[PDB]
RNA sequence: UGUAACGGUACAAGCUGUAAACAAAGG
RNA sequence: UAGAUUUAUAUAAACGGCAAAAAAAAAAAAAAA
RNA sequence: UGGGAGCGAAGAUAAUCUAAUAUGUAGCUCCGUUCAUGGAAAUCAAAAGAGCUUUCACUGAUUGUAUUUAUGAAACGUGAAAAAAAAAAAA
RNA sequence: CGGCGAGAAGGGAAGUGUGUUUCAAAGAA
RNA sequence: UGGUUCGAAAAAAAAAUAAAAAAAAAGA
RNA sequence: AGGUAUGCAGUAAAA
């Protein structure tokens, strides 16, 4: 109807770029490894990718893969909230789209107060929810070239699958050979590496999902499959060198349910470390501050007194007695419930 | 004659494309190396020396490419600026060339009378 | 009335707005008469500087320059832009990538991007001709700027320079000291000798002397420092009277308040000039030493302020480092005659050396040679990494030195060769540097000046006395050659 | 087609292309901005891509 | 309003100058 | 219904006919512009008005006579100091909502930098944000401290040096013109040094002899020119005027009685009446 | 414009490229650049079509006083 | 913030009431008569706008400022312990 | 794009642009 | 698509603050389109 | 543009006149029409259920608003048309 | 011959008797 | 002899007009 | 008491 405000945003599917004629540089120019866009030697300047370092200082991270359909300011606030978990954030900037300044091109810069805070922040990628297009933001430290671990989630999923397979293998070995000593049983268990699934000695999934074999045995539901019995790393080895693993006699259905439960619990553990809360180890916030935080995402309902005027005269009697009395009764009920909550 | 000149210009532009692309890539790589070298100092390091050697090689290649490009740039941009010998006001010979008037702020902001005395 | 929705409640003004074509509704499969497809558009220049097309964009993109339309002020600005380390990254891009451009960085680069400097020779000639044309309509300050800009950018056409000299000589009596300093800047070492017309130089010096004599009150301390620097170096003057007048105006002209607020770099250059021309000052501690101390104190105060305080700050930090290096080098020569931990000379020298130690990277090759000379003269060391880390960079930057810098470096290396206590890296680095420096000095002997020759002879004598076990023959040859060259130049 | 414009091979800006003919009858497309000849159009073999919407229809 | 001062003297009994500082945390 | 933060709750789900037939004069009080979905005004886009802007309301009486009237926003002219822009910004038109939003964000600079476009509702604010980011990219231009509107346009951004040069040139032209006008209208006139004696009437009897004129300004031509320019700087008087920057300033309304010209029903200016008299807006 | 404005613009341009000497120049290979004549492409090379007596003649645009040649 | 309910309409202008003229702020320095450092005080918007913020005595109580103060105090305590 | 002014053409509600109704047979 | 093709139709918008003269130093300076 | 946005009348009906109707119409300014509008529920409903949005017919000139004139493609619902949700962690 | 159960927001709306029903003010062609 | 042109003084614009055609290397 | 014949800037005085 009218010119669009920032509430109306549009974006379009990007066709993958194919150089159909490799020698035709005029119509199929090379992409730049820095900007990931077509080289334009006539009207562009070379970029080393470190330019923002001269602007934001050494303690700076570049964030990539930011989604569409969001204001640069909204994304700046969200990124500030996320990166506050690692220290004091001096600044957050989000580059606008070439064709829509209200949207982002997909790049941002975060300037930290402390080198240690920035280095801690760079370690893991940032997984976003569906409302942010499920994007996984990739982080790059400008002062050390350190990058985020974009394969962390899928490597951990593979580790969880390997742990379930290890549990099944050990249960089968116990069912076949009977009770076995720990240091001999553990050497019969193998995992498949990520991503090509090459057989390996099972020692990495255990330490990435549980921290140790004792943790694996003592954490549910594997303690419902196995029972450790007495006849640092040195303590672990010595303690395992004098044990026997005994099985809990289960049926096929119970064992299958237990394996599914173990998978689900490990999945929850994986999601927790990616969705750690942003208020962890921070002071409480006043009600006004919490309302200001909320307003970045949601607007409060408009006052009902203003809203009443929308009742059209064609079918409604504006300011009607029964309608207003209904409003008063609802208000009274809400106040009574609040009083009950207080008491 | 103008068809011949057009063919010549296209021929040289098709080489300029590759030379300029290579120059662009060399420039971005050299800037990356220079930033990496600056970021580390005043420390002295074997990695620093290797960066310096790579930078020297890239600088030599860039100079060679620029030397190659200098004549090609001049010939491919010969008709971007007006040659008065080809304009309709100075002659009626066949094959005139016409250029549209530009907006130069430093002149659009001056007050001058419409005097054409030369 | 349609009640708004989540996507529709925000709207922009029909005429005052931010254009966002990605989200604005459009039907590209239809003809739009409003855009006037039939009408051809004009291709404007893609880069402009000072309202005209940028000359740094012409080698790559071409197009007309309109140089003949440029007035004196624009021409002087353009000449400065071309002369002062131009970078093609200063040019404007067209629809650039969202990420920041390399123009943001303040650091210099070891390679020239997008074209060589010599790819602008024709435009340089055109600019020189246009400067000769516009010289008659410029005010005094703009004319001085045009002269200096032509000299610095490298206009060499002799008729152009003759016209410029004529106009400048015409309008010299109407110029104040700042314009005289601007003109003197065009006579710096390395610039074309066409501008060094002896009669014009004599007239400029005489006018500056009259300005000092009749307007000493209005002279600023930084202006006096620049004047002394130019007189000693730019104009190659033996005007002991003028230099002494400048020194007196700097010290006893109620100028102590202004000496604190003047920039330290100007004071460093001034004390360098006085150290070069000591004999003139010490003519009817030494007075030169007192002058050096008076100029040094504010530099040390600025150093102390910076340390106590501990992109913008980088420039001032670099300037302060250069000032410290130059001040230390200037003080070293005077200390050669003192040989004591003088109440303030030695201490300010040590503080400058400490500043150099904490900012070794910022040093230019001349700064490296100066600081090595100062440290070797003082027989001190700001730290244990100083000598090795400075010798490494001196070797890496040997090619950009001048005869004076090479003489200083050779003096320092001769002094260092006689020290028994040295680090392994210093021992390894020394002999190659000594050999290369000796080769460079021998190559550049015919272009060395009298001060450089004297320093080289002193270094040769010191080595013969104390460093007779390293390249002994070359040092005797250097001593004899320096003696003969000094005899010839004194006869000249 | 009016929302689109040909690009000059040298300046890479919207241009106008005229057909000129040599003595032998060879045709040359020339661009107004730089006077450059137009490069030969990319071949159908290189340009070809399947039209999946028609298969869907 | 023939006389229209830019600054109007504030009223003593207006609710604006007497409103309560409110509470930082509602729960306590 | 949905969109409870926006006006029209009971219109959202009543039908198409009611929505198209809605009568604006049904709404007596003004609705906030953001919740109504109203286009920002040019004044709002040239100032920082946040939630406030031109609105409308209806007058209804016991006789059931309806009347709709346009109502202007409550706007003040205030000066701000911006560190990000390195300059004082005089006479920005601001509102109470905008001031409260600046308080919430943490000041003028924070409000300009952080506010989303929908909430800011100010193209001028967006341009200020752009200039702040440009200054961050290029600090050396920030050190000049020029008025921020110098770099409002993108072309000035691309050519900063010409922007500053042109700004100074126009400023100097303005200064020279004003100086010449003041000199022309100055109350002090200095005649030529070769004929300083003006025509006089016969001195009244008993008047003491006037001393010979002291022409100290004839020693040097430079002194003469300086004295002449100084004399040209003089002014006859200085006038007082309404200025909101002064604590005791005020403006004027209409006459005390409140009447009007007899027999004349004056029509107020509109966009279809006296629309473009003497100025665009 | 006031002369201070011109001074300001010139100084802002002058101070836009200050910094330390990164990159090594161990050898002197002179404030104005010198071009070597044996590296410039010849007319034949310049006119040659692209690949994946005109060989002894060079057409150079530049400063002959800065060219490095055996004879001029 | 302003409220859009029952505004005053006069002279063709609209003036909106401010039911809540108070805002919370964090005290960065000792303000005689207001509180000590690190306290969250409800003050008047004018007081914050024209005295406290200009004089650098307090700042708006945003989560950013609160967290920055908390982390700075923790760092200062750790610095004390390191010095000891 | 569309239209028009002058000019040429049967001094024209047509055609047409000072090359003003026609080049198609060039190293 | 063999060439040629005057003049008017106030156009730096193939482009971006508004606002006279398709875009005018800051301020004065004001807006439902 | 009887589509959408802003401002916004009187002649005419009310047998004068007011509201309401005319009508959110005309004029004025701005979008420029299926590659569009809009839109994947903090929805509607009853204690069973439906399932973004959109178009047609019925329910029905019903329940409504106006209370002398008239206005009213109401809501739920029913029968049809069309049918869609979301390629998308990097490569 | 099925067993104490698979992370469902503590918020919105619905009669004011909410024990019950429904939704999540947060995302693409 | 006037207009043009500078001033008054004017985009307060006489459609098909000009000291008014891309604006100095101009080749004397 | 508009501008007169090498022409552009530019200050003062005045039958």
XYZ file of C-alpha atoms in Angstrom, chain A residues 1-12 35 37 40-47 51-52 54-55 68 95-103 105 107 109 299, chain C residues 6-14 17-25 46 60-61 88-102 104-106 311:
80
model
C 0.000 0.000 0.000
C 2.686 2.441 1.149
C 6.469 2.299 1.248
C 7.683 -0.613 3.410
C 8.950 -0.154 6.946
C 11.375 -2.473 8.686
C 8.538 -4.861 9.576
C 8.295 -5.919 5.913
C 11.391 -7.849 4.816
C 11.966 -10.039 1.765
C 14.821 -12.220 0.553
C 15.275 -14.629 -2.338
C 34.645 -11.792 0.424
C 31.834 -12.788 -3.977
C 35.401 -6.907 -9.677
C 38.887 -5.570 -10.370
C 37.451 -2.509 -12.133
C 35.359 -1.131 -9.258
C 36.465 -2.990 -6.096
C 39.586 -3.061 -3.962
C 41.354 -6.173 -2.620
C 40.392 -7.091 0.946
C 40.481 -4.691 7.973
C 38.027 -4.724 10.886
C 42.301 -1.943 12.624
C 38.860 -0.637 13.643
C 17.877 -12.835 6.817
C 26.927 -5.210 8.406
C 23.787 -4.326 6.402
C 22.790 -6.032 3.175
C 23.934 -4.324 -0.024
C 20.334 -4.287 -1.284
C 18.456 -3.742 2.004
C 20.051 -1.685 4.815
C 17.383 -2.937 7.237
C 18.632 -6.520 6.775
C 24.516 -9.213 4.692
C 28.517 -10.658 8.747
C 32.015 -7.997 14.323
C 5.352 -5.498 22.229
C 2.890 -7.978 12.128
C 4.393 -7.286 8.695
C 2.555 -4.068 7.773
C 2.317 -1.702 10.754
C 5.651 0.039 10.084
C 5.780 2.371 7.076
C 8.103 4.995 5.616
C 7.364 8.469 4.317
C 6.441 8.622 0.642
C 13.057 7.335 3.067
C 15.870 4.814 2.993
C 15.772 2.976 -0.368
C 15.674 -0.816 0.040
C 15.050 -2.412 -3.382
C 15.293 -5.958 -1.986
C 12.029 -5.552 -0.051
C 10.193 -2.998 -2.219
C 7.534 -4.676 -4.339
C 33.316 6.684 -10.713
C 42.931 1.751 -14.043
C 39.616 3.253 -15.202
C 45.136 3.645 -5.116
C 43.076 2.347 -2.183
C 42.142 5.967 -1.416
C 40.051 5.894 -4.602
C 36.320 5.340 -4.186
C 34.719 2.011 -5.057
C 31.406 1.432 -6.834
C 28.837 -0.650 -4.945
C 31.602 -2.050 -2.709
C 31.481 -5.217 -0.626
C 29.863 -4.722 2.790
C 33.126 -5.418 4.624
C 35.462 -2.473 5.304
C 37.971 -1.361 2.670
C 41.775 -1.406 3.062
C 40.787 2.190 6.814
C 44.246 0.897 7.721
C 46.809 3.599 8.486
C 44.058 4.288 15.253
